[PDB]
Amino acid sequence: DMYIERAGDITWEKDAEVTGNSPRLDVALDESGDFSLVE
Protein backbone atom coordinates (compact mmCIF):
# COMPACT_ATOMS: atom_id res chain seq x y z
CA ASP A 1 0.00 0.00 0.00
CA MET A 2 1.28 3.47 -0.89
CA TYR A 3 1.24 6.46 1.50
CA ILE A 4 2.23 10.17 1.58
CA GLU A 5 4.48 12.18 3.98
CA ARG A 6 4.83 16.01 3.95
CA ALA A 7 8.23 17.12 2.66
CA GLY A 8 7.95 20.95 2.73
CA ASP A 9 6.34 24.21 1.53
CA ILE A 10 6.12 25.29 -2.10
CA THR A 11 8.14 28.54 -2.16
CA TRP A 12 10.79 30.15 -4.36
CA GLU A 13 14.13 30.58 -2.42
CA LYS A 14 16.28 33.62 -3.20
CA ASP A 15 19.95 32.65 -3.62
CA ALA A 16 19.40 28.93 -4.30
CA GLU A 17 22.02 26.68 -6.05
CA VAL A 18 21.90 27.71 -9.78
CA THR A 19 22.98 24.82 -12.11
CA GLY A 20 21.99 22.80 -15.26
CA ASN A 21 22.00 23.59 -18.97
CA SER A 22 19.06 24.38 -21.46
CA PRO A 23 19.30 21.81 -24.32
CA ARG A 24 16.92 21.91 -27.34
CA LEU A 25 16.00 18.34 -28.26
CA ASP A 26 13.85 16.86 -31.02
CA VAL A 27 11.69 14.25 -29.18
CA ALA A 28 8.76 11.82 -29.75
CA LEU A 29 5.98 10.98 -27.24
CA ASP A 30 4.54 7.49 -27.72
CA GLU A 31 1.03 6.30 -26.70
CA SER A 32 2.43 4.97 -23.37
CA GLY A 33 3.58 8.47 -22.30
CA ASP A 34 7.28 7.71 -22.96
CA PHE A 35 9.64 10.30 -24.51
CA SER A 36 12.40 9.30 -26.93
CA LEU A 37 15.11 11.13 -28.90
CA VAL A 38 14.43 11.87 -32.59
CA GLU A 39 17.54 12.59 -34.66
Binding site: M2, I4, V18, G20, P23, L25, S32, S36
Partner: protein, 156 residues
Protein backbone atom coordinates in the same frame (compact mmCIF):
# COMPACT_ATOMS: atom_id res chain seq x y z
CA UNK B 1 -5.76 12.91 7.28
CA UNK B 2 -3.19 15.38 5.89
CA UNK B 3 -4.79 17.86 3.44
CA UNK B 4 -2.31 20.77 4.02
CA UNK B 5 -0.95 22.57 0.89
CA UNK B 6 2.72 21.64 0.21
CA UNK B 7 5.11 19.05 -1.36
CA UNK B 8 4.87 15.37 -0.24
CA UNK B 9 6.85 12.14 -0.66
CA UNK B 10 5.11 9.03 -2.11
CA UNK B 11 6.24 5.91 -0.22
CA UNK B 12 5.61 2.13 -0.36
CA UNK B 13 6.18 -0.73 2.08
CA UNK B 14 5.83 -3.57 -0.58
CA UNK B 15 9.60 -3.83 -1.25
CA UNK B 16 12.33 -3.98 1.50
CA UNK B 17 11.82 -1.29 4.20
CA UNK B 18 10.17 2.01 3.24
CA UNK B 19 10.89 3.00 -0.38
CA UNK B 20 10.24 6.37 -2.06
CA UNK B 21 8.62 5.80 -5.48
CA UNK B 22 7.94 9.49 -6.20
CA UNK B 23 6.76 12.97 -5.01
CA UNK B 24 3.57 15.08 -5.36
CA UNK B 25 1.86 18.44 -4.83
CA UNK B 26 -1.08 19.06 -2.53
CA UNK B 27 -3.05 22.19 -3.49
CA UNK B 28 -6.72 23.13 -2.89
CA UNK B 29 -7.41 19.70 -1.33
CA UNK B 30 -6.13 17.80 -4.42
CA UNK B 31 -2.99 15.60 -4.67
CA UNK B 32 -1.14 15.94 -8.01
CA UNK B 33 1.55 13.44 -9.04
CA UNK B 34 2.89 11.50 -12.09
CA UNK B 35 0.89 8.45 -13.33
CA UNK B 36 3.98 6.17 -13.46
CA UNK B 37 4.62 6.84 -9.69
CA UNK B 38 1.28 5.39 -8.42
CA UNK B 39 -0.06 3.58 -11.53
CA UNK B 40 -3.46 5.11 -10.44
CA UNK B 41 -3.58 3.23 -7.11
CA UNK B 42 -5.23 4.60 -3.91
CA UNK B 43 -3.07 6.46 -1.38
CA UNK B 44 -2.95 6.60 2.44
CA UNK B 45 -2.42 9.79 4.51
CA UNK B 46 -2.51 9.07 8.24
CA UNK B 47 -5.94 7.58 9.01
CA UNK B 48 -7.26 9.12 5.73
CA UNK B 49 -7.49 7.65 2.26
CA UNK B 50 -6.99 9.54 -1.03
CA UNK B 51 -8.79 8.04 -4.09
CA UNK B 52 -7.81 8.95 -7.75
CA UNK B 53 -10.20 11.32 -9.61
CA UNK B 54 -8.58 12.01 -12.97
CA UNK B 55 -5.62 10.52 -14.79
CA UNK B 56 -4.02 10.06 -18.22
CA UNK B 57 -1.06 7.66 -19.09
CA UNK B 58 -0.06 9.73 -22.20
CA UNK B 59 0.22 12.98 -20.17
CA UNK B 60 1.71 10.85 -17.29
CA UNK B 61 -0.42 12.72 -14.72
CA UNK B 62 -2.91 11.82 -11.97
CA UNK B 63 -5.04 13.90 -9.53
CA UNK B 64 -6.48 12.62 -6.19
CA UNK B 65 -9.66 13.82 -4.33
CA UNK B 66 -10.58 16.24 -7.12
CA UNK B 67 -9.77 17.67 -10.55
CA UNK B 68 -6.31 18.97 -11.63
CA UNK B 69 -5.75 22.39 -9.98
CA UNK B 70 -2.28 23.43 -11.24
CA UNK B 71 -2.55 25.78 -14.25
CA UNK B 72 0.47 28.23 -14.13
CA UNK B 73 2.76 28.08 -17.24
CA UNK B 74 6.47 28.64 -18.08
CA UNK B 75 6.83 32.07 -19.78
CA UNK B 76 9.50 30.76 -22.22
CA UNK B 77 12.17 33.20 -21.00
CA UNK B 78 12.77 33.03 -17.27
CA UNK B 79 14.80 30.73 -15.01
CA UNK B 80 12.78 28.34 -12.76
CA UNK B 81 13.42 26.28 -9.60
CA UNK B 82 13.04 22.53 -9.27
CA UNK B 83 11.82 21.93 -5.69
CA UNK B 84 13.54 18.54 -5.61
CA UNK B 85 12.48 16.01 -2.96
CA UNK B 86 15.10 13.22 -3.29
CA UNK B 87 14.76 9.81 -1.56
CA UNK B 88 15.89 10.04 2.08
CA UNK B 89 17.12 13.63 1.61
CA UNK B 90 15.68 17.04 2.48
CA UNK B 91 13.61 19.17 0.03
CA UNK B 92 15.97 21.48 -1.92
CA UNK B 93 15.42 24.25 -4.52
CA UNK B 94 17.69 24.07 -7.59
CA UNK B 95 17.51 27.03 -9.95
CA UNK B 96 17.99 26.38 -13.66
CA UNK B 97 17.07 27.79 -17.10
CA UNK B 98 14.86 25.36 -18.99
CA UNK B 99 15.60 23.92 -22.41
CA UNK B 100 13.02 22.80 -24.99
CA UNK B 101 11.55 19.52 -26.17
CA UNK B 102 10.49 20.00 -29.83
CA UNK B 103 7.67 17.63 -30.76
CA UNK B 104 5.51 17.21 -33.90
CA UNK B 105 2.65 18.65 -31.75
CA UNK B 106 4.39 21.69 -30.21
CA UNK B 107 7.30 22.77 -28.01
CA UNK B 108 7.44 22.08 -24.23
CA UNK B 109 9.87 23.31 -21.56
CA UNK B 110 12.49 20.86 -20.29
CA UNK B 111 14.66 20.68 -17.11
CA UNK B 112 18.19 19.19 -17.30
CA UNK B 113 18.93 17.98 -13.73
CA UNK B 114 20.22 14.57 -12.55
CA UNK B 115 18.20 12.99 -9.74
CA UNK B 116 17.20 9.41 -8.86
CA UNK B 117 13.88 8.03 -10.27
CA UNK B 118 12.26 8.31 -6.78
CA UNK B 119 12.32 12.11 -7.31
CA UNK B 120 9.54 11.90 -10.03
CA UNK B 121 6.67 14.28 -9.26
CA UNK B 122 8.84 17.07 -7.73
CA UNK B 123 7.30 20.43 -8.64
CA UNK B 124 8.79 23.08 -10.93
CA UNK B 125 8.25 26.70 -9.76
CA UNK B 126 7.83 30.20 -11.21
CA UNK B 127 9.19 33.42 -9.49
CA UNK B 128 5.88 33.82 -7.58
CA UNK B 129 6.06 30.22 -6.31
CA UNK B 130 3.26 28.90 -8.60
CA UNK B 131 3.66 25.31 -9.81
CA UNK B 132 4.23 25.48 -13.59
CA UNK B 133 4.68 21.67 -13.89
CA UNK B 134 6.08 18.39 -12.53
CA UNK B 135 9.56 16.86 -13.02
CA UNK B 136 10.05 13.15 -13.73
CA UNK B 137 8.99 12.17 -17.27
CA UNK B 138 11.70 12.62 -19.85
CA UNK B 139 14.67 11.03 -21.52
CA UNK B 140 18.27 9.85 -20.80
CA UNK B 141 20.74 11.38 -23.31
CA UNK B 142 24.32 10.49 -24.60
CA UNK B 143 26.26 10.06 -21.26
CA UNK B 144 23.49 8.80 -18.98
CA UNK B 145 22.33 12.37 -18.12
CA UNK B 146 18.63 13.02 -17.50
CA UNK B 147 16.41 15.67 -19.12
CA UNK B 148 12.78 15.87 -17.90
CA UNK B 149 9.81 17.58 -19.60
CA UNK B 150 7.96 20.40 -17.77
CA UNK B 151 4.67 18.43 -17.44
CA UNK B 152 1.56 20.51 -16.75
CA UNK B 153 -2.12 19.41 -16.81
CA UNK B 154 -5.29 21.28 -17.77
CA UNK B 155 -7.50 23.01 -15.14
CA UNK B 156 -11.23 22.72 -16.03
Amino acid sequence: GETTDGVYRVMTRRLLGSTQVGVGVMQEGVFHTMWHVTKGAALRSGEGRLDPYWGDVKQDLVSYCGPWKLDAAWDGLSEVQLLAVPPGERAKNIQTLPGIFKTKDGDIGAVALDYPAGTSGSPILDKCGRVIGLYGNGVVIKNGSYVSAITQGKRE
